[PDB]
């Protein structure tokens, strides 16, 4: 920018979307990456592999296409995250993918976070992924219990639209139960 | 196709330059060879440019020299039309000369020594200390120029 000698960062570094130092350490495993990403409203999980002209996504799952199996709840929470991971995980198994390493991008490794929920989901789908159980939220929270008990302090329905008043972690069970099922159109 | 004639001896010439002449089958002063005009050969002659005389000869001249100085791969045997006819893919010297000039074959392929051992230039040459443009005999020559030299070294 200033002159001939000026040094402009790599594009994805300017955009502040790719931590290249973390990326290298990640790519060293030689395994595919389980890309866990978040949006204010959605959660995405991708199984990316290295390629000659750029990465290759062999399977993915977006919280949006979660409804395609019977999801009538919001898509920016724990139950949403876990399920999206499981879906992507299952699709991954179908593609022949057997193992991966969790890539959480610029998100923080906070215990019980959603990226770890995504990870737990993928692991349950049958994917072998280096993890640490006690960094994963305890079952109930993944189910969405923390949200139900929150709506208990009602007086005003947590959810605007009507999915339900006291919400349902039971819906979480139905959807998971539905995915672990062999049939299911992936 | 160019005609190469070494006009300057080996003493004091760079070794990589001397080795080049040897790869072009010339091992003595006044020895001539016929070389196709390729990028590969072009570099070689450019490297030897200062110890040689070269250029494209006329059909006739090549014929005179072939008759007078060509030799079998082995032996004394004169290389005349009959020889050419009973040993080569051609009917006479002219057919051979033409094919060489048109770069369709080589003296070797036809069972001939790759080298034409010429005689010193009758009447002397223009000197080996200057190029053609300066009045000398070194470097690239005119077709008429090469012809004069080759004919003189008949």
């Amino acid at each position: 920018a200033t002159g001939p000698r000026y040094k402009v960062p790599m594009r994805r570094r300017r955009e502040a979307r790719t931590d290249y130092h973390q990326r290298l350490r990640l790519l060293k495993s030689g395994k595919p990456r389980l890309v866990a990403r978040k949006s204010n409203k959605h959660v995405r999980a991708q199984l990316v592999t290295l390629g000659p002209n750029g990465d290759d996504t062999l399977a993915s799952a977006h919280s949006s296409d979660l409804a395609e199996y019977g999801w009538e709840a919001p898509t920016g929470n724990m139950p949403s995250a876990y399920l999206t991971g499981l879906l992507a995980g299952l699709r991954a198994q179908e593609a022949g993918v057997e193992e991966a390493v969790l890539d959480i991008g610029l998100n923080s490794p906070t215990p019980g976070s959603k990226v770890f929920a995504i990870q737990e989901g993928a692991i349950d789908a049958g994917l072998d992924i280096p993890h640490n159980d006690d960094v994963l939220a305890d079952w109930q929270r993944t189910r969405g219990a923390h949200i139900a008990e929150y709506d208990e302090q009602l007086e005003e329905p947590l959810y605007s639209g009507d999915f339900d008043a006291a919400d349902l972690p039971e819906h979480f069970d139905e959807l998971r139960e539905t995915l672990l099922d062999g049939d299911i159109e992936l | 196709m160019h005609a190469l004639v070494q006009l300057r001896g080996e003493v004091n010439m760079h070794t990589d330059i001397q080795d080049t002449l040897e790869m072009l089958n010339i091992h003595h002063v006044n020895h001539c060879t016929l070389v196709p005009e390729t990028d590969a050969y072009r570099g070689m002659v450019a490297k030897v440019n200062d110890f040689v005389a070269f250029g494209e000869p006329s059909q006739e001249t090549l014929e005179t020299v072939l008759a007078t100085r060509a030799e079998p791969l082995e032996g004394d045997a004169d290389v005349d039309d009959e020889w050419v006819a009973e040993h080569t893919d051609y009917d006479d010297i002219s057919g051979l000369a033409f094919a060489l000039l048109s770069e369709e074959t080589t003296l070797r392929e036809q069972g001939l020594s790759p080298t034409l051992r010429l005689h010193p230039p009758r009447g002397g040459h223009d000197g080996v200390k200057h190029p053609v443009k300066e009045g000398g005999q070194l470097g690239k020559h005119d077709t008429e120029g090469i012809d004069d030299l080759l004919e003189a070294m008949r």
């Binding site: 000698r5 000026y6 040094k7 290249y20 | -």
Partner: protein, 95 residues
């Protein structure tokens, strides 16, 4: 030379042009080569580890197996055969 260390006279060859300064892209540090492949050797100023002796910059060897994540590349120093341990970060496929 006034000294005989490994980096003597390596000012130029081990320095980045200002614009190529800074951490290098990971892609080439993870590249995979097969035994028999011809590879050019050139140290990447920005990459500290996995280097070979500077004297060998410019060589084009032959991958002949590996040691850990680094590669074992065969070359000929003058007339002598040598095996060089080097990571992909400092290698490039020939052609």
């Amino acid at each position: 030379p006034s000294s005989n260390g490994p980096l003597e006279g390596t000012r130029g060859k081990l320095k980045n042009k200002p614009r190529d300064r800074g951490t290098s892209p990971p892609q080439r540090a993870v590249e995979e080569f097969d035994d028999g492949e011809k590879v050019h050797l050139k140290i990447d100023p920005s990459v500290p580890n996995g280097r070979f002796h500077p004297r060998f910059d410019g060589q084009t060897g032959t991958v002949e197996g590996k040691q850990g994540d680094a590669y074992k590349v065969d070359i000929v120093d003058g007339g002598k055969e040598k095996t060089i341990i080097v990571t992909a970060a400092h290698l490039r496929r020939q052609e």
